[PDB]
């Protein structure tokens, strides 16, 4: 079973497909992070001429000062509409499908060949502070959830994609992955996105190394299948809830 990203745009049809095992369980699809508690930059690229645009030159490419510092451009970029460094904002995500794996739950797979260092998807969710994080830890333990969706963003910001997020919440862990996190500044705010680290052939599952900070009493077994698998999500050590959440 597999589905494409447009299948998640219609909640009623999605909920029906989920009841027949054709889509994962319903969640609230969001376009950007939602803060439970709200908290308290133009590059120097020379604008492309119309002829350079027509000949295929890239605006705000590899030499863009903002891109080099993992900062996206705004609407006021000197290249305006042509700026290629607004991928998070313009939802310029990779062509990926959501698939059912044999025993990891649902996962993500490439629907085309993905070049190295291709933006896949932003990891969106509800952003929690430490107090809200502990409340959700308790709730998900009481609910006996199997899958966990917490991503550390910065000191007192944990992204929780359990209830609200996007298809990035389906990326599974691998001990030998083909994607990574990158933290990007968008409008003075930090976001996390997934990016390939190598050429990913069409049909391949997309994975990243969770570097999981496990507070649970027991670690989940890892089924990534890599020759150098660590055996468990969390590895050897158990950490406290407070350390896992950024202390």
């Amino acid at each position: 079973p597999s589905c494409v990203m447009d299948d998640f745009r219609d909640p009623q049809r999605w909920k029906e497909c989920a009841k027949q095992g054709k889509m994962p369980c319903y969640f609230d699809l969001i376009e950007e992070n939602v803060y439970l508690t709200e908290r308290a930059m133009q590059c120097e690229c020379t604008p492309l001429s119309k002829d350079e645009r027509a000949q295929g030159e890239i605006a705000c490419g590899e030499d863009c000062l903002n891109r080099l510092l993992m900062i996206e451009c705004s609407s006021r970029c000197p290249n305006g509409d042509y700026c290629s460094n607004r991928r998070f904002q313009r939802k310029q995500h990779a062509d990926v499908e959501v698939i059912l794996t044999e025993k990891k739950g649902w996962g993500l797979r490439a629907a085309k060949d993905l070049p190295s260092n291709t933006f896949v998807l932003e990891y969106c969710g509800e952003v929690l502070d430490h107090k809200e994080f502990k409340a959700r830890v308790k709730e998900y333990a009481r609910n006996k959830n199997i899958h966990y969706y917490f991503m550390a963003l910065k000191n007192d910001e944990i992204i929780d994609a359990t209830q609200k997020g996007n298809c990035s919440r389906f990326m599974n862990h691998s001990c030998e992955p083909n994607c990574e996190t990158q933290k990007w500044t968008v409008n003075g705010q930090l976001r996390v996105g997934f990016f390939t680290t190598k050429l990913v052939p069409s049909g391949s599952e997309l994975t990243f190394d969770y570097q999981f900070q496990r507070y649970g009493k027991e670690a989940q077994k890892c089924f990534c299948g890599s020759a150098n698998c660590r055996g468990y999500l969390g590895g050897e050590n158990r950490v406290s809830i407070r350390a896992a959440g950024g202390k």
Binding site: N145, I146, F150, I158, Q182, V192, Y215
Partner: peptide
């Protein structure tokens, strides 16, 4: 003491 759970930690792939 939850039986299961943890937090994913961003890092640059090495």
């Amino acid at each position: 003491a939850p039986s299961t759970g943890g937090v994913m930690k961003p890092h640059r792939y090495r």
